[PDB]
Design an enzyme around this catalytic site. Structure first.
Site, PDB file in Angstrom:
ATOM      1  N   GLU A  35       3.847 -16.646 -34.319  1.00 58.17           N
ATOM      2  CA  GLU A  35       2.606 -17.173 -34.885  1.00 58.17           C
ATOM      3  C   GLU A  35       1.912 -18.165 -33.937  1.00 58.17           C
ATOM      4  OE1 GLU A  35       0.893 -16.321 -37.436  1.00 58.17           O
ATOM      5  OE2 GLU A  35       2.280 -15.127 -38.579  1.00 58.17           O
ATOM      6  N   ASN A  46     -10.229 -16.775 -37.908  1.00 63.22           N
ATOM      7  CA  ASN A  46     -10.183 -15.410 -38.445  1.00 63.22           C
ATOM      8  C   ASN A  46     -11.555 -14.792 -38.557  1.00 63.22           C
ATOM      9  OD1 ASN A  46      -7.798 -16.893 -40.636  1.00 63.22           O
ATOM     10  ND2 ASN A  46      -7.312 -15.541 -38.976  1.00 63.22           N
ATOM     11  N   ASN A  59      -3.304 -20.620 -43.255  1.00 66.48           N
ATOM     12  CA  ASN A  59      -4.725 -20.339 -43.299  1.00 66.48           C
ATOM     13  C   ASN A  59      -5.535 -21.250 -44.195  1.00 66.48           C
ATOM     14  OD1 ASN A  59      -6.626 -18.473 -44.931  1.00 66.48           O
ATOM     15  ND2 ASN A  59      -6.948 -17.945 -42.945  1.00 66.48           N
TER      16      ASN A  59
END
EC number: 3.2.1.17
Length: 129
Positions: A35, A46, A59
Site C-alpha cells: 500500500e 483516487n 481512504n
C-alpha cells in the site's frame, strides 16, 4: 517515517494487530508493504477525488476528514493528516474499524491482489520476537 519490515511488525503487534479479526501479523505487514512501501507519509489521490493516506492507505471517502472530499464520511473521527504521523496509533485504530466492517482485509485492494492466499508468514520471518 519509512519503517523497516520487522520494526513495523513489532509496532503493529504492540498495537494489537497480530491475529486481529483472524488476520495474522504477516497479513498486515504485507498490506503495508504494497500500500505504502512502509512509508507513513504516503498519499495517493483516487479518480473520484478522494485521497488515501498513510502506511495502510486509508481512504477519505469513508474513514477520515481531509476537507476536500465532498459528501464523504469520517467514520474513524480523525483528520486524515493524523494517518501520516510517524506514530502508527491512529492508522492502526482506524484499520481495526475498517477490518471489522464486514469485508475483512478485502477493503485493501493491494492485500486482495498481492497478499491474500500467499505465504504471508514470510513477511515476519526472522523478526525478533
Amino acid at each position: 517515517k519509512v519503517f523497516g519490515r520487522c520494526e513495523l511488525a513489532a509496532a503493529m503487534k504492540r498495537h494489537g494487530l497480530d491475529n486481529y479479526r483472524g488476520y495474522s501479523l504477516g497479513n498486515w505487514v504485507c498490506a503495508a508493504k504494497f500500500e505504502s512501501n512502509f512509508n507513513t507519509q504516503a498519499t495517493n489521490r483516487n479518480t473520484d477525488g478522494s485521497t488515501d493516506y498513510g502506511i495502510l492507505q486509508i481512504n477519505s471517502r469513508w474513514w477520515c476528514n481531509d476537507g476536500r472530499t465532498p459528501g464523504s464520511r469520517n467514520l474513524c473521527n480523525i483528520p486524515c493528516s493524523a494517518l501520516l504521523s510517524s506514530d502508527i496509533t491512529a492508522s492502526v485504530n482506524c484499520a481495526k474499524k475498517i477490518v471489522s466492517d464486514g469485508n475483512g482485509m478485502n477493503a485493501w485492494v493491494a492485500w486482495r491482489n498481492r497478499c491474500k492466499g500467499t505465504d504471508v508468514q514470510a513477511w515476519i520471518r526472522g523478526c525478533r520476537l
